Scaffold this active site. Sequence first.
Site, PDB file in Angstrom:
ATOM      1  N   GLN A  19       0.849  -1.214   0.000  1.00 13.91           N
ATOM      2  CA  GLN A  19       0.000   0.000   0.000  1.00 13.91           C
ATOM      3  C   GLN A  19       0.877   1.254   0.000  1.00 13.91           C
ATOM      4  O   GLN A  19       0.473   2.362  -0.343  1.00 13.91           O
ATOM      5  CB  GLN A  19      -1.020   0.018   1.157  1.00 13.91           C
ATOM      6  CG  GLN A  19      -0.414   0.069   2.451  1.00 13.91           C
ATOM      7  CD  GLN A  19      -1.519  -0.193   3.538  1.00 13.91           C
ATOM      8  OE1 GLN A  19      -1.972  -1.317   3.865  1.00 13.91           O
ATOM      9  NE2 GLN A  19      -1.837   0.876   4.253  1.00 13.91           N
ATOM     10  N   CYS A  25      -5.392   0.689   3.143  1.00 17.61           N
ATOM     11  CA  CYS A  25      -5.602  -0.719   3.544  1.00 17.61           C
ATOM     12  C   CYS A  25      -7.011  -1.156   3.171  1.00 17.61           C
ATOM     13  O   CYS A  25      -7.161  -2.308   2.749  1.00 17.61           O
ATOM     14  CB  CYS A  25      -5.354  -0.858   5.071  1.00 17.61           C
ATOM     15  SG  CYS A  25      -6.383   0.190   6.068  1.00 17.61           S
ATOM     16  N   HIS A 162      -7.665  -1.199  10.692  1.00 20.21           N
ATOM     17  CA  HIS A 162      -6.996  -1.765   9.511  1.00 20.21           C
ATOM     18  C   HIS A 162      -7.921  -2.709   8.848  1.00 20.21           C
ATOM     19  O   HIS A 162      -8.890  -3.190   9.420  1.00 20.21           O
ATOM     20  CB  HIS A 162      -5.702  -2.535  10.013  1.00 20.21           C
ATOM     21  CG  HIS A 162      -4.791  -3.040   8.967  1.00 20.21           C
ATOM     22  ND1 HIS A 162      -4.653  -2.370   7.747  1.00 20.21           N
ATOM     23  CD2 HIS A 162      -3.968  -4.142   8.909  1.00 20.21           C
ATOM     24  CE1 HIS A 162      -3.785  -3.013   7.013  1.00 20.21           C
ATOM     25  NE2 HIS A 162      -3.352  -4.090   7.727  1.00 20.21           N
ATOM     26  N   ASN A 182      -1.885  -9.562   4.372  1.00 19.82           N
ATOM     27  CA  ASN A 182      -1.742  -8.130   4.641  1.00 19.82           C
ATOM     28  C   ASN A 182      -1.262  -7.450   3.332  1.00 19.82           C
ATOM     29  O   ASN A 182      -0.978  -8.125   2.321  1.00 19.82           O
ATOM     30  CB  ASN A 182      -0.763  -7.959   5.837  1.00 19.82           C
ATOM     31  CG  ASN A 182      -0.912  -6.634   6.538  1.00 19.82           C
ATOM     32  OD1 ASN A 182      -1.672  -5.770   6.163  1.00 19.82           O
ATOM     33  ND2 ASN A 182      -0.189  -6.490   7.649  1.00 19.82           N
TER      34      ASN A 182
HETATM   35  C1  LIG Z   1      -5.210   1.455   6.844  1.00 13.75           C
HETATM   36  C2  LIG Z   1      -4.508   0.860   8.063  1.00 13.75           C
HETATM   37  S1  LIG Z   1      -2.736   0.980   7.896  1.00 13.75           S
HETATM   38  O1  LIG Z   1      -2.285  -0.081   7.017  1.00 13.75           O
HETATM   39  O2  LIG Z   1      -2.396   2.338   7.479  1.00 13.75           O
HETATM   40  C3  LIG Z   1      -2.147   0.734   9.556  1.00 13.75           C
HETATM   41  C4  LIG Z   1      -2.707  -0.158  10.381  1.00 13.75           C
HETATM   42  C5  LIG Z   1      -2.225  -0.347  11.706  1.00 13.75           C
HETATM   43  C6  LIG Z   1      -1.087   0.382  12.073  1.00 13.75           C
HETATM   44  C7  LIG Z   1      -0.454   1.290  11.221  1.00 13.75           C
HETATM   45  C8  LIG Z   1      -1.030   1.499   9.925  1.00 13.75           C
HETATM   46  C9  LIG Z   1      -6.098   2.640   7.133  1.00 13.75           C
HETATM   47  C10 LIG Z   1      -5.267   3.816   7.734  1.00 13.75           C
HETATM   48  C11 LIG Z   1      -6.155   5.118   7.676  1.00 13.75           C
HETATM   49  C12 LIG Z   1      -5.464   6.344   8.297  1.00 13.75           C
HETATM   50  C13 LIG Z   1      -4.333   6.909   7.649  1.00 13.75           C
HETATM   51  C14 LIG Z   1      -3.634   8.046   8.204  1.00 13.75           C
HETATM   52  C15 LIG Z   1      -4.169   8.506   9.413  1.00 13.75           C
HETATM   53  C16 LIG Z   1      -5.292   8.044  10.024  1.00 13.75           C
HETATM   54  C17 LIG Z   1      -6.021   6.875   9.465  1.00 13.75           C
HETATM   55  N1  LIG Z   1      -7.174   2.286   8.016  1.00 13.75           N
HETATM   56  C18 LIG Z   1      -8.477   2.313   7.636  1.00 13.75           C
HETATM   57  O3  LIG Z   1      -8.795   2.650   6.457  1.00 13.75           O
HETATM   58  C19 LIG Z   1      -9.559   1.910   8.635  1.00 13.75           C
HETATM   59  C20 LIG Z   1      -9.988   0.434   8.352  1.00 13.75           C
HETATM   60  C21 LIG Z   1     -10.819  -0.210   9.513  1.00 13.75           C
HETATM   61  C22 LIG Z   1     -12.230   0.048   9.376  1.00 13.75           C
HETATM   62  O4  LIG Z   1     -12.861  -0.548  10.517  1.00 13.75           O
HETATM   63  N2  LIG Z   1     -14.166  -0.535  10.455  1.00 13.75           N
HETATM   64  C23 LIG Z   1     -14.878   0.385  11.250  1.00 13.75           C
HETATM   65  N3  LIG Z   1     -14.049   1.234  12.000  1.00 13.75           N
HETATM   66  N4  LIG Z   1     -16.204   0.394  11.306  1.00 13.75           N
HETATM   67  N5  LIG Z   1     -10.654   2.845   8.602  1.00 13.75           N
HETATM   68  C24 LIG Z   1     -10.274   4.165   8.995  1.00 13.75           C
HETATM   69  O5  LIG Z   1      -9.142   4.434   9.373  1.00 13.75           O
HETATM   70  N6  LIG Z   1     -11.200   5.136   8.811  1.00 13.75           N
HETATM   71  C25 LIG Z   1     -10.887   6.501   9.181  1.00 13.75           C
HETATM   72  C26 LIG Z   1     -12.010   7.442   9.274  1.00 13.75           C
HETATM   73  N7  LIG Z   1     -12.970   7.251   8.200  1.00 13.75           N
HETATM   74  C27 LIG Z   1     -13.430   8.380   7.350  1.00 13.75           C
HETATM   75  C28 LIG Z   1     -13.059   5.886   7.655  1.00 13.75           C
HETATM   76  C29 LIG Z   1     -12.520   4.804   8.539  1.00 13.75           C
END
Ligand SMILES: */C(=C\S(=O)(=O)c1ccccc1)[C@H](CCc1ccccc1)NC(=O)[C@H](CCCONC(=N)N)NC(=O)N1CCN(C)CC1
Length: 215
Positions: A19, A25, A162, A182
Amino acid sequence: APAAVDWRARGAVTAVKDQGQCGSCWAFSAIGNVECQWFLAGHPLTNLSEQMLVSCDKTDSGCSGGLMNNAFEWIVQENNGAVYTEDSYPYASGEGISPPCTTSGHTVGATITGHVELPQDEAQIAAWLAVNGPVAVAVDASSWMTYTGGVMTSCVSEQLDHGVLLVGYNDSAAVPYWIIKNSWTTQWGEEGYIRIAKGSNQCLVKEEASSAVVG
Ligand SMILES: */C(=C\S(=O)(=O)c1ccccc1)[C@H](CCc1ccccc1)NC(=O)[C@H](CCCONC(=N)N)NC(=O)N1CCN(C)CC1
């Protein structure tokens, strides 16, 4: 359910991705799921586009995160089920900046008709996975930063942060486990995969499991 299933061994799972420096993710989880579901409906295994979702799915937030269930709803409700090929819409967000959505010049690689949200129940998710293939799941991966291998049995299980892909399980092993794909390259974990123990809602794995539907 079968004692053990590994969809990688059945040729259902594409290569591990990277990614990059982008919180996409959720798009890799949702596309990995569609790739597998499309192959299991009798089509050739086809590489599909995360960039389509990161750039064009405005119900999610691009490099700042999303939900796989939103991605599946966007594909079906806004893009007539279509998921473009990777080759025709290649990933471009690895330094954290997603290009703007482009609609024309992309080739449809797969079509989905809907998605199913599975029960919050590891045994039911496993039985579904054995018959119907890999499952997108949200997890808390905050404790995954030092993982190098083995069956994790102390995953911090506090906040979904994630999205990943369940590709199999093994109920026969001394410590029963899930096999998870992953999107942090093949250098991370077990050639890009992690095993977490199965049956104790490790990483909140049961909480938001879903799959696209083909056909
Ligand atoms: C991906 C996770 S990652 O690979 O970046 C990671 C995981 C664990 C440790 C380090 C890095 C993304 C990261 C999004 C992000 C990026 C920068 C800053 C803040 C957040 N994670 C997601 O997309 C996450 C997925 C899980 C969804 O779970 N389901 C529910 N919570 N119902 N979803 C989110 O991060 N978001 C953020 C706020 N939203 C607008 C959507 C959900």
